[PDB]
Amino acid sequence: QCVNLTTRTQLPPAYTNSFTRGVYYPDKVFRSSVLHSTQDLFLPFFSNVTWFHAIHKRFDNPVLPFNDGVYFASTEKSNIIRGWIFGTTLDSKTQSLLIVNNATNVVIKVCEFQFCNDPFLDVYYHKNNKSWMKSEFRVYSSANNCTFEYVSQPFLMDLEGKQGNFKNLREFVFKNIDGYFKIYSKHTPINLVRDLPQGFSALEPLVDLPIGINITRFQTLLALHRSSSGWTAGAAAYYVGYLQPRTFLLKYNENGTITDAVDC
Amino acid sequence: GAISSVLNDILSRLDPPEAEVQIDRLITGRLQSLQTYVTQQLIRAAEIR
Amino acid sequence: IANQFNSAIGKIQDSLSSTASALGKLQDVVNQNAQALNTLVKQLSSNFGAISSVLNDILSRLDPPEAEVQIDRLITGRLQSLQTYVTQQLIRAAEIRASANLAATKMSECVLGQSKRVDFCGKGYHLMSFPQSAPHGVVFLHVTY
Amino acid sequence: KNKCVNFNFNGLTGTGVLTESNKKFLPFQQFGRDIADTTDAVRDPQTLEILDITPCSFGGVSVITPGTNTSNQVAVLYQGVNCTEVNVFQTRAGCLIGAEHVNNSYECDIPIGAGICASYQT
Amino acid sequence: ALDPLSETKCTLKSFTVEKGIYQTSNFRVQPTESIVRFPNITNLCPFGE
Amino acid sequence: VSMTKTSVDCTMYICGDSTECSNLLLQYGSFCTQLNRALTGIAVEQDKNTQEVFAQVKQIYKTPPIKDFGGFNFSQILPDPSKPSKRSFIEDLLFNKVTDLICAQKFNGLTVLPPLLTDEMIAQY
Amino acid sequence: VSMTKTSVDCTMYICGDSTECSNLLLQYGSFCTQLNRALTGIAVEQDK
């Protein structure tokens, strides 16, 4: 909760450039064999994105401003990331949106949460009988005054620690417009070492959340393990970016999938 | 048809909604005058060709 | 004179098949018509200052007297937009009719007859012209000395 | 299906012919549109199908008749549409009713289109 | 509206129709019936309970 | 020579499927009528361009069955009867290099009128 | 032979020094974007 980790070490906010990232399907309108010009909140091409990671002596769980919207890209092996928490104060002073996975399903609700300096979901005593079950919950102490509750499709997250290169890529978009929270999700495998791969990806909707609360900040909830100050987190890398009102040319193929995009 | 022919004058006097009503007569009048110039250029261009 | 002509016609086939830009004169006619029609349709989506560009929306939302005010704005702009299209077509109609008259003059002088005009039937002394059909136009093969 | 109707799908309305096509929409995109920003297709909100929306048939109506002193005979011609309502024949220009088809070729008198002309004769 | 010949006379504003073809009207197909398709009623609150 | 034939309906283009919109359109007088007659006249003139250009003769001329011109090969410029649609070898390329779309516009409210003179008849001229 | 080439800007001419005024011009669609190509075509014909 309020106790900082022993091995956690601060690092300078290194930056890296994303190439085509920030392209998504604007809305439910389908189009094919046409080139459309969409003006909305986007991630500019070749724009510097923040460089963060979490390992066993550098663990990154800071607070970042949400502004109007943000882009998210990360690669996972043991799926360290549990979810995200959104809100103005990220505390019980007001309402806060929480998108997380408990290893059963994806829980989405808005309540008044007790803020912690270092929220996360920890586990301990693995050794043989790898365990990895929910025991100690450090994200928030209690919740109340819930104005929203939602349950998405079920999923089982495998938190078993893994080694080697990053075999997965997960790119999300988090934005709020006219009191309507929109979220995009794309999951594709990739062979990656560090930095980011070079390629194009078409982001797709995930869920529609007409929440309508003010979000000035957000956190990235991670999972910790030990074989809670002495608990570590597996090797993972995630990136954060800010969206700007930029115009892209979305090229729709015969099947409707976006082949490529260009920033004017 | 607008109260004044200056854009800064109408914007600093009438409200944004009221100025749009006057600006409509300014743009509508300027469009008819602008299109009239382009239409004459196309006709004059044909005579030159 | 046979080895020159037969070889010349061979160059027309090779140049015509290899070079697709020589016909841009005709492709421009199709482009101008396509752009004018595309723009003419896209103007219907604009609201023209009205609360909404859809008639059914203002009828099902605004009051009867409020809709009439909005219908006037939509009709006014849509009318002007259609006047612009017609105005442009009549002007372009004078350009195509002018080019058609030139094709008729060359057809009679260069093809049907033999003209002594300088560089009207093409560089050099004109001998004979063979017309060829092309979409929305005509092609002339001028044999010169 | 296959009829001119006034359709209301979710919050979308319009008049046109509903014909199921082979188009495949993105599962998260229910309604499609053409290059002109006008819906060319839709996905049934209930059943899984893709309905191509074709606006109902319409076109100009032309009257083919000889001079008043010649005769009062009339032949109606439709533009850009085949014979629907309805000597009922079809041409490339559209449905032509009230005239007889003659294979023999004659000099054009009343122009119609697509290399077809009409005249008042035996 | 009596006959298509009269439509030609009214279109020309004269009783004398010269040999030729003229456009007297525009044909349009009207809708046969209204169609309404809305999604399922799923996600119901059990008020019966 | 020829330009695309288009016929626009000022009643349908301005007011889609609207009775009230069409009633208020009558207050503007002949603006609608003029815009329809204007495009109608152009479509008629576009056909005149083909009559004053393509066909210069009232008779049909044919080549002899035996071709000896003295060593000149006109086969490329002349029509090939083996083709399904009569055209020469030069016209075959002219047709491929120069470029349904017209049907979609017809239903969108912009009518594409077919030309009076077909392309096949142009090849015969 | 050649006519004086003049390129008029419907964005600068219509609304001087006004962001709000220019906002109303977007409601008219291509009217501004269309007039720009009409004058540009005349300038190209002057060189030919």
PDB file of C-alpha atoms in Angstrom, chain C residues 9-20 23 27 132-135 139, chain F residues 76 83 87-99:
ATOM      1  CA  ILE C   9       2.871   2.384 -88.638  1.00  0.00           C
ATOM      2  CA  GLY C  10       4.861  -0.087 -86.553  1.00  0.00           C
ATOM      3  CA  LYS C  11       6.188   2.818 -84.497  1.00  0.00           C
ATOM      4  CA  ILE C  12       2.633   4.080 -83.929  1.00  0.00           C
ATOM      5  CA  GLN C  13       1.609   0.699 -82.513  1.00  0.00           C
ATOM      6  CA  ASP C  14       4.688   0.463 -80.286  1.00  0.00           C
ATOM      7  CA  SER C  15       4.435   4.076 -79.101  1.00  0.00           C
ATOM      8  CA  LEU C  16       0.674   3.824 -78.545  1.00  0.00           C
ATOM      9  CA  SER C  17       0.966   0.595 -76.546  1.00  0.00           C
ATOM     10  CA  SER C  18       4.007   1.723 -74.545  1.00  0.00           C
ATOM     11  CA  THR C  19       2.950   5.335 -73.913  1.00  0.00           C
ATOM     12  CA  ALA C  20      -0.398   5.636 -72.124  1.00  0.00           C
ATOM     13  CA  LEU C  23      -4.189  10.065 -74.667  1.00  0.00           C
ATOM     14  CA  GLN C  27      -8.644  11.100 -69.990  1.00  0.00           C
ATOM     15  CA  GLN C 132      -9.264   6.242 -85.777  1.00  0.00           C
ATOM     16  CA  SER C 133     -12.084   5.884 -83.264  1.00  0.00           C
ATOM     17  CA  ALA C 134     -11.348   6.670 -79.616  1.00  0.00           C
ATOM     18  CA  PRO C 135     -13.669   6.931 -76.590  1.00  0.00           C
ATOM     19  CA  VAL C 139      -7.581  10.098 -83.272  1.00  0.00           C
TER      20      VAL C 139
ATOM     21  CA  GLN F  76      -3.161  -2.240 -88.304  1.00  0.00           C
ATOM     22  CA  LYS F  83     -12.747  -9.504 -83.360  1.00  0.00           C
ATOM     23  CA  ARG F  87     -12.335  -2.338 -84.470  1.00  0.00           C
ATOM     24  CA  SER F  88      -8.828  -1.935 -85.820  1.00  0.00           C
ATOM     25  CA  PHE F  89      -5.612  -2.890 -84.047  1.00  0.00           C
ATOM     26  CA  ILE F  90      -4.978   0.785 -83.283  1.00  0.00           C
ATOM     27  CA  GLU F  91      -8.510   1.321 -81.960  1.00  0.00           C
ATOM     28  CA  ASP F  92      -8.089  -1.781 -79.781  1.00  0.00           C
ATOM     29  CA  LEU F  93      -5.321   0.028 -77.900  1.00  0.00           C
ATOM     30  CA  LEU F  94      -7.200   3.343 -77.888  1.00  0.00           C
ATOM     31  CA  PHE F  95     -10.075   1.591 -76.102  1.00  0.00           C
ATOM     32  CA  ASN F  96      -7.905  -0.094 -73.455  1.00  0.00           C
ATOM     33  CA  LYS F  97      -5.804   2.966 -72.564  1.00  0.00           C
ATOM     34  CA  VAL F  98      -8.838   5.252 -72.054  1.00  0.00           C
ATOM     35  CA  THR F  99     -11.163   4.439 -69.156  1.00  0.00           C
TER      36      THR F  99
END
